[PDB]
Amino acid sequence: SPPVYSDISRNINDLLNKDFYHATPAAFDVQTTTANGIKFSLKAKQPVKDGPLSTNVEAKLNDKQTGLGLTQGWSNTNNLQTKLEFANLTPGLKNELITSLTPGVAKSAVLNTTFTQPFFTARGAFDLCLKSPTFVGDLTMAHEGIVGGAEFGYDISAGSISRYAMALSYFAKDYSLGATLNNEQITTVDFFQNVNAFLQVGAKATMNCKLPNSNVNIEFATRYLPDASSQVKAKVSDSGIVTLAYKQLLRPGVTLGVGSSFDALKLSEPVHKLGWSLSFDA
Amino acid sequence: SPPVYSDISRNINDLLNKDFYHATPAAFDVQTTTANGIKFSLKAKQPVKDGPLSTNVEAKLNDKQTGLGLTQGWSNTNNLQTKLEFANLTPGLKNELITSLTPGVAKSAVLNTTFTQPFFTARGAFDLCLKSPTFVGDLTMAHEGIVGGAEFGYDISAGSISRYAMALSYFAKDYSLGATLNNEQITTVDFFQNVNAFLQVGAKATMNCKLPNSNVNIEFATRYLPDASSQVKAKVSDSGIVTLAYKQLLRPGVTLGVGSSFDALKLSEPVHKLGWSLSFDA
Amino acid sequence: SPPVYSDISRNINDLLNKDFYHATPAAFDVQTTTANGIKFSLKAKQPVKDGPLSTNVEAKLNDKQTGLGLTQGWSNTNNLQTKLEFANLTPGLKNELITSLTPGVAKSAVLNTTFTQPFFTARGAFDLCLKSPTFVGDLTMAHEGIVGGAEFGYDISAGSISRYAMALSYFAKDYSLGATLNNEQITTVDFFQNVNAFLQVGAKATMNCKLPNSNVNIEFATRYLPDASSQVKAKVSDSGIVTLAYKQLLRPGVTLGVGSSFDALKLSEPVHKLGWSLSFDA
Amino acid sequence: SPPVYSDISRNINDLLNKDFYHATPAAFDVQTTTANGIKFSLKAKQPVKDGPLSTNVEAKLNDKQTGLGLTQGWSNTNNLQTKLEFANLTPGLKNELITSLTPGVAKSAVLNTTFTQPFFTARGAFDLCLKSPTFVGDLTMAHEGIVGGAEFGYDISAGSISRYAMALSYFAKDYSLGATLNNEQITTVDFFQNVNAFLQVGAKATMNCKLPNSNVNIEFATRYLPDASSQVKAKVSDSGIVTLAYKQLLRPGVTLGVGSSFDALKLSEPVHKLGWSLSFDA
Amino acid sequence: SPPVYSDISRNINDLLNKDFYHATPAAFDVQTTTANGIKFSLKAKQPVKDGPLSTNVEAKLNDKQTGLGLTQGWSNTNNLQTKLEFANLTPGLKNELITSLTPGVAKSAVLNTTFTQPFFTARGAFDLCLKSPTFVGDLTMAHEGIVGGAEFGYDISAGSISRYAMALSYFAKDYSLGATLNNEQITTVDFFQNVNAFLQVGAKATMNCKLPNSNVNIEFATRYLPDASSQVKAKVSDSGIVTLAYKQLLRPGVTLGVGSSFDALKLSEPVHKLGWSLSFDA
Amino acid sequence: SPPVYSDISRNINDLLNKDFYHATPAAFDVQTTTANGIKFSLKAKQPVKDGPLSTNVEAKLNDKQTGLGLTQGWSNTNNLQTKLEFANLTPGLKNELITSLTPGVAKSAVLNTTFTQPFFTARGAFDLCLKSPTFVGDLTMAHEGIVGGAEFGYDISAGSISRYAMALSYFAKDYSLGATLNNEQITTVDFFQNVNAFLQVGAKATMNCKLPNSNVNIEFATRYLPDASSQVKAKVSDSGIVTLAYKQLLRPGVTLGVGSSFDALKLSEPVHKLGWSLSFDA
């Protein structure tokens, strides 16, 4: 099945968003399942090293039936997030919806409809509650590994098109190259090369075609697995930011993560990021 | 028989308010039972780190006879809390009474009647030996899995309802979800989950629905058993309060517990309470 | 037969009064029995490390032939205390006579008459020599285990009662309770329990109803036997006064005892002290 | 192999400086390994006045693959210590590197090197990255059972030495004497004796030859094993400081130690301490 | 071989100056022997109630080889002694030395030569390392039971005789008398008697003829053995000083002693001294 | 064989001058013998309770050979009291002599000669040293139980008779009456009546024939012997002086005596004479 627009070239942005523990100095995740399968979890993060500790509790369930689902998330700041997944009649056509109920912050309900069919993937977006009807449509076609994609943020209230973005990639067994153009001023390219099951390497460049300011922005990210129960991966950028991350498996079920961010060829400077994470799983 | 309302969600209440030793730096318990069947005890606690040495001695008996159950006890606070259980005529009609006899300070007697029926629980309490008597009652109903109930309180002196609460839970084979609301002002949703025979985990969130205050007060506790004669448990609140506890059974009949009270992101201020306890049993 | 009034609650009054070697820093007891049958003894006490040394020698004998019993005393103060015990009148009525001859202080003589019958016990004491006739008596009954008595002191010169106390206890197979009320209030409630041959525990509370809204002094003492040739025991109190004692039988005939009494909690007051005791036998 | 200098009289120091937990009133450490050999460890202490906490976590590994060593630690003060050990350049010469990283305190790095070979061993240290290199070196030789060593520190800023010591030991099967001479006219003469598997005694006396005013101190400590899962220590200093320690092994995998240190014969100065320690091992 | 002059009437001197514990309130001895021949010791006495805890450690060896013997004692109060005993060339000619090295105080070593012949004893002591050397020499003869001898002290600096004493004693099977004269100013007569293996008794009288009032002070001592593992002994002088002592072996290698010192004349003055001693042996 | 003068009417003198422990508040006698036969003893008596303690040491020997004997005594008052006994040639004719060497008090040497032959016992005592030679002669005849006696003191320096005493008694199986007259001014009549082996009674009166002052004084002395290991005996005189004494045998070899004295014509509280006495024996 062809990937969805959000999942095109997921392998490259997956190597610089996940398993990075340099942003939150502390992290505390607990996951647990029950007999019938209702998953529950609690996450505790800390953005500022000398500030409060944010915590959210999530209750998500799925079923191998026609596709009913329900997710209820409740954080410290009380933005209750509810999900609803179902297809029922039409197979492959899921109807998802997300809300954010808050006594202080205005609620925002988003309706997503995804139709899955070979060589064709499209997604709808409907905004409710607040008076701002926007349809963030997107289309994706797959032709012998060539994956195309177009995103358009058409505004009903204004009557015009806000965002117009294009993307084109080519998937293969152990290599995939893609590119994207956002509103014809941001150009992004990637070079993902999978070495083997024990090593991954990727590159991501933002050419940013714009005559007033062109500069250069490149990132090289690696991922090395010494063995099954370990992981170490680091990225490097031209600005000197070199971030390292080390994920270790303690007693089977609990994982520990250490992340750090050094700045090369800039002496030491009075700034540095380092943090740890402790994830449990029943 | 459905559980009494006052004893609803005892599973979650026993994770964060029971078998914790951090409020008293030292404690001494002795539990002796005579051949007659009177169980004598002693509790030598210590509330203040450099103050008085609190100690109490109590006796009680519980026989499978017609139901004469007597309990008494003295303490260092110069008060007595006697207890008297009996059924006699009606089976299941528990008529308990609690006194707070104290020299000088006016005593108060609380007379409780608990009457059980299949799928019905009713408990009432009269506050006698007081110039301003009060009555408090509660009701509990069962729905073959949905255990609900409520409580009301009537002031005899005033002539109206003083405190109205309503609770509704959902028991299952290995998890339980409940929620209680009092005065439309305090709200508490609990959660208890038995992973397996050797691990328990639960959460409790008090939201306090009101416009002036913000955020929420949530808590998360676990309980682990390395084997029969051990118990290690830990709880964490959103404020960073992390309390540990570890009870160990050295000799058969002798238990030793320890406990700390850390503070995430505050290792520079003396707030950390820490204590131990020795309990003996013949 | 009902116990004497002074022997009421002897199992508890004796548990926390004897074998505590903390008051005297030194002790030297020699007991020898001569061939004729008189029992000589020599006690050597010394209160406080620097100061006087008290030496007491006495010789006592009992004859089961006719019931004559004589005791001869001699202290370092050069005073003699005799004790003549005899009945020779009827089975169930014996009299005792005690003198306190001292060259400097006026000698005093006391005549005690004890007359004991099934279910009734009474005795009286007189005060001769010095012009102060005081008659102290008591009367105890026993109704199948419940043992209650009362004592009173009448002054002939004054013409009224100077002290009026009443005690009531409930003995059993292995535990005993009881409450005594002296002249004003000082209502004292005790508790003694003999769990097995290798451990005894006990408590003793004094309500002191004379002063309303005040503290209450309670004590709790144990007694443990590691084997048949040793003893160790301890007592606590609400003021933190903790007393330990250890009696070891070094060789048959010679026993040693080490006792300390440190004030726990606050370890700043110099009130710890320490004492030992040696007892011989021939 | 000849003993290295720090191992000279290592038994004496490991007798009166180890397992004496009377200083810190609390200690909690967890030791655990992973699927591969990493051996995480977490220690947490507490000073006397229940002030801050001193917690750190470290992971050391000794890979037998071409003799690799790595020890990275992390304390709550953002203090990271890195230890690198390797010997793959010459058989019999191993190189160590110790680093310290922390924002506030200046960064430090010492390069250690040890040259070992039969009948000859020497060390060398370079405390660099401080704008003041201090060469700390020493060497020791053994002939037939008598070992002797010497230290020296030469500074390039002053052009001379600032500290030198001369050691002389006579090891044997079960006892070892020893004598050190420090440039401050300090002479420590010590002896260690291992009478049997259940008892070890030792003594150590320091003589200050700089000030000949009877300034001689002498301590001695013992180590007894009542069984194979217990340990009792006792150290007596000349000033009357007596230190006790009792390491009891609970269920195999957890140890608990209780230490106390008072001043004998002077129970008036607040110099006595009591503390405990819990060691968990997975 | 006849006893040396210092060893005449050692039996009486081992009654009133041995195995008494009325001097030091507390003492602690441990004696350890390695499987080489070296014997260590750790003594911890206490001179007065307000003095430092005295401590010394000595090690000595006595080999059945050619005769080399070394004794070295490191003390706390800078009163070290070292002894060197050997015979080597002549069998029986013992050449000992004693040192009193003290930092600050001029040491005074003494060189002792002892020659034993049948019916001839000659001992000479040279006081070297002193500005005013002395020489103390004594001779001892024996006539089939009557043991006599004399001692003279010649001053090298002066050239005269300072100390001139004689002694004459009669040893027998179970008793021994003897009178010694010192400078025709001090005359003493002793008496030692051995009733049987379970009892000893002796007396000592000093007259001091160079006194106008004489005031002869005699002493009478006993020694009783209740069994193999006990030793009770008491002595009494004219002024009523009655000192008791009791040595008991609790475990094999562990001995305990208790000593007291009465006055038996005046009992309102703190003249009484008291003490205990606990010695160990491996 | 007829009794010597000093032994006539000794039975009555034995009931008032022996086993009366009322004069010395404290006594301490130790007697010991040796396998060959020289008896040694040490006595310690205290005349006044607030004074010093006098002590003497005696060494006396006797043999079944021709009759040589030697006694040597030495006390605090420094008197070398010696006794020399010998007969050699003539059997029965002993020649005793007593001296008292004292540096301060003049020596006194007395020579006693006693010739023993049936029906004739005479004694002569000389006087030496001091220049006041006397001769104390006495003669004694026995005729069928009638015992006469005449004592004369002739002064050599004066040439007259100073003391002229005449005694006459009649000994029998279990009764004896005596009468003596000294200087025709001192009349004494003795009446001893032996009841049996378990009781002795005696009386002694002194008429004192003198017209100016005649008065009367009589003494009745009893002695009760309960068994072999006990004795109790008292005397009563007409002067209001009654004294009691008790002798006990505690362990086989050691005796204990207690003496007391009352008063009838005076009574009062602060007049009492009591004292104890210990006497060992090897």
Query: SS3 of C169, please?
Result: strand
Helix (H, G, I), strand (E, B) or coil at B71: strand
Q: Find, among E106, E158, E107, the residue nearest to E134 by Cα.
A: E158
* Distance between F275 CA and the closest CA of chain C, angstroms: 10
Dist CA E102 CA B152 (whole Å): 90
DSSP D202-264: EEEEEEETTSTTT-EEEEEEEEE-SSTTEEEEEEEETTSEEEEEEEEE-STTEEEEEEEEEET
In b/e form, how buried is each residue of B33-72, taking b as 16+ CB within 10 angstroms?
ebeeebebbbbbbbeeeeeebbbbbbbbbeeeeeeebebb
B-chain residues within 8 Å CB-CB of A52?
Answer: 239
Q: Please enumerate in sequence order all residues whose Cβ is within 8 A of that of A153, keeping only pairs 6 or more positions apart, or say none.
A: A134, A135, A136, A137, A161, A162, A163, A164
Query: Nearest 5 degrees, angle CA C189-CA C7-CA C80?
Result: 125
Count of positions (residues) in chain B:
282
Which chain C residues touch E49 with a CB distance below 8 Å?
Answer: 49
Contacts with E183 (C-beta within 8 Å, 6 or more apart), sequence order = E163, E164, E165
* CATH number of domain containing E42: 2.40.160.10
Question: Cα–Cα–Cα angle for C143, C148, C154, nearest 5°?
Answer: 135
SS3 F13: helix
Mutation choice for E interface testing from F24, F28, F29, F32 by most E CBs within 10 A: F32
Contact call for residues C142 and C2 (beta carbons, < 8 A):
yes
Instruction: Kindly report the nearest CA distance between residue B187 and chain A, in angstroms.
Output: 14
- C278:E258 CB<8 A: yes
What is the Rg, in whole angstroms, of the alpha carbon atoms belonging to chain A?
A: 21
How far, in Å, CA of F257 to CA of F247, rounded?
4
Report how far residue A137's alpha carbon sits from residue A112's, in angstroms, rounded to the nearest whole number. Answer: 10
Measured between beta carbons, the chain C residues lying within 8 angstroms of F272 are 103
**Tally of CA atoms within 13 A in the half-sphere of A64 that contains its CB:** 2
Interchain pair E74, D205: CB under 8 A: yes
Angle at F128 between CA F123 and CA F134, to 5 degrees: 55
Q: Cβ(D162)–Cβ(D177) under 8 Å?
A: no
Interchain CB distance below 8 Å, C34 and F226: no
Token pair for residue A50?
């000398």
Q: Which two tokens stand for residue A196?
A: 């083997």
Who among D34, D78, D282 is closest to A249 (CB)?
A: D34
Residue A229 near chain B (CB below 8 Å): no
Which chain C residues are Cβ-neighbours of D268 within 8 angstroms? 270
Residue E229's H or E segment, with its range, is none
Q: Which of E121, E123, E117 is nearest to E140 (CA)?
A: E121
Cα–Cα distances in Å, from F233 out to F2, F197, F236?
Answer: 29, 14, 11
- Half-sphere CA count of A127, side-chain side, radius 13 A: 15
For D239, the token pair is 């000033």
**Out of A26, A54, A57, whose CB is closest to B203?**
A57
Say if B216 is an interface residue toward chain A (CB within 8 Å).
yes
* Among candidate residues D200, D196, D198, the one with its CA nearest the CA of residue D229: D198
Q: How far apart are CA F18 and CA F13, in angstroms?
A: 8
Decide if A44 contacts A27 (C-beta within 8 A): yes
Instruction: Classify burial at A228, counting beta carbons within 10 Å of its beta carbon; exposed 0-12, middle 13-18, buried 19 or more.
Output: exposed
User: Which residues make beta-bridge pairs with E246?
Assistant: E232, E258
B-interface mutation test, from C201, C219, C233, C266, most B Cβ less than 10 A away: C201
Write the Ramachandran bin of E88: left for phi over 0, alpha for psi from -120 to 50, otherwise beta: left
CB pairs under 8 A between B and C: 69
Nearest to D223 by CA among D252, D253, D243, D251: D243
Contact criterion met (CB < 8 Å) for B35 and C266: no
Structure token pair of residue D174: 């079960």
Kindly state whether D36 is in contact with chain C, defined as any CB-CB distance less than 8 angstroms: no
Nearest to E201 among F32, F44, F103 (CB): F32
Q: CB contact, 8 Å: C106 with chain F?
A: yes
- Provide the shortest C-alpha distance from residue D33 to chain A (in Å): 8
Residues of C in contact with F229 (CB under 8 A): 34-36
Q: How far apart are CA E277 and CA E271, in angstroms?
A: 20
- Paired strand residues for F247: F231, F257
Question: For residue D263, which phi and psi values (nearest 5 degrees)?
Answer: -110, 115
DSSP reduced 3-state for E167:
strand
CA atoms within 13 Å, Cβ hemisphere of D141: 1
Strand partners, B159: none
Write out the two tokens for B193: 């989950």
State whether residue D200 sits within 8 Å of chain E by CB.
no
- Bind-site residues of F for ATP: 10, 18
**B274 and D26: CB-CB below 8 Å?**
yes
Q: Which chain E residues are within 8 Å of D172, Cβ to Cβ?
A: 34, 36
Ramachandran bin of C181, using left for φ above 0, alpha for ψ from -120 to 50, beta for the remaining angles: beta
Instruction: Give the integer Cα–Cα distance in Å for B139 and F210.
Output: 121
Q: Which residues of E touch C76 (CB under 8 A)?
A: 267
Q: In this complex, do C276 and E276 lie within 8 Å of one another by their Cβ atoms?
A: yes
| Cα D74 to Cα D54: distance, rounded to the nearest angstrom | 11
Start-to-end Cα distance in chain A = 32
F269 inside 8 A of chain C by CB:
yes
CB C248, CB C9: distance < 8 Å: no
Judged by CB atoms closer than 8 Å, whether chains meet at C35 and F272 is answered as no
The rounded distance, in Å, linking the Cα atoms of C52 and C44 is 11
Beta strands A273-279 and A27-32, pairing class: parallel
CA angle (F34, F35, F40) in 5-degree steps: 15
Nearest CA in chain A to D40: A250
Is residue A269 within 8 angstroms of chain D, CB to CB? Answer: no
**Nearest chain D residue to A251, by CA:** D34
CA E212 to chain centre: 30
Q: Does D270 touch chain C (CB under 8 A)?
A: yes
Domain total in chain A: 1
Could you write out the three-class secondary structure of A104-115?
CCCCCCEEEEEE
Chain E residues near residue D193 by CB distance under 8 angstroms = 32, 34, 40
> CB F251 to CB C32 under 8 A?
yes
Report yes or no: C114 and C125 within 8 Å, Cβ to Cβ: no
Q: Count D/E contacts: CB-CB distance under 8 Å.
A: 69
Q: Is C45 one of the annotated binding-site residues?
A: no
Q: Residue D174 and residue E40: Cβ atoms within 8 Å?
A: no
Count of CB atoms situated within 10 Å of the CB of D89: 8
Structural domain boundaries, residue E36:
5-281
Subunits next to C (3 or more Cβ pairs <8 Å) are B, D, E, F
CA atoms within 13 A on the CB side of A245: 25
Instruction: Please judge whether D38 and A249 are an interchain contact, meaning their C-beta atoms are less than 8 angstroms apart.
Output: no
Provide the shortest C-alpha distance from residue A43 to chain B (in Å).
Answer: 11
Closest CA to C235 of C222, C225, C224, C216: C222
**Cα D170 from chain centroid (whole Å):** 20
Tokens of B270: 């003396």
Interface present between A and C (3 or more CB pairs within 8 Å): no
D268 at C interface, C-beta within 8 A: yes
Contacts of E267 in chain C (CB under 8 A): 52-53, 55, 76
Largest Cα separation within chain D, whole Å, is 61
Say whether D250 and B246 touch across the interface (CB within 8 A): no
Is C103–F248 a contact, with Cβ atoms under 8 angstroms apart?
no
Chain E contact partners (≥3 CB pairs within 8 A): C, D, F
Residue A12: in which H helix or E strand, if any? Answer: helix A10-13
* Inter-chain residue contact D267 with C272, CB threshold 8 Å: yes
d(CA B54, CA B45): 5
Distance of alpha carbon E147 from alpha carbon E192, whole angstroms: 15
Helices (H), chain F: 10-13
Contact B193, B200 (CB under 8 A): yes
Q: Is C209 on the interface with B (CB under 8 A)?
A: yes
Q: Which tokens go with F175?
A: 């009764």
Produce one character per residue of C209-243: b if its CB has 16 or more CB atoms within 10 Å, e if not: eeeeeeebbbbbbbbebeeeeebbbbbbbbebbbb
Q: Are A172 and A9 in contact (CB under 8 A)?
A: no
CB-based burial of residue F109 (10 Å sphere; 0-12 exposed, 13-18 middle, 19+ buried)? middle
Q: Quick one: which H or E segment has residue E122? A: strand E120-127
Residue A258: CB partners within 8 Å, gap ≥ 6? A21, A245, A246, A248, A274, A275, A276, A277
Q: Evaluate whether A233 touches A19 at the Cβ level (below 8 Å).
A: yes
CA pair distance A210, B121, nearest whole angstrom: 75
Paired tokens of F269: 């509280």
Determine the residue among D30, D32, D34, D39 to mutate to test chain A binding: the one whose Cβ has the most chain A Cβ atoms within 10 Å.
D34
List b or e across C70-103, with b for residues whose CB sees 16 or more CB atoms inside 10 angstroms.
ebbbbeeeebbbebebeeeeeeeebbbebbbbbe
Residues 6+ apart with CB under 8 A from B102: B78, B79, B80
Which two tokens mark D153?
């520190």
Spatial distance between the Cα atoms of F9 and F3, rounded to a whole number of angstroms: 9
φ and ψ at A254, to 5 degrees? -120, 130
**Residue D220 to residue E57, Cβ atoms within 8 A:** yes
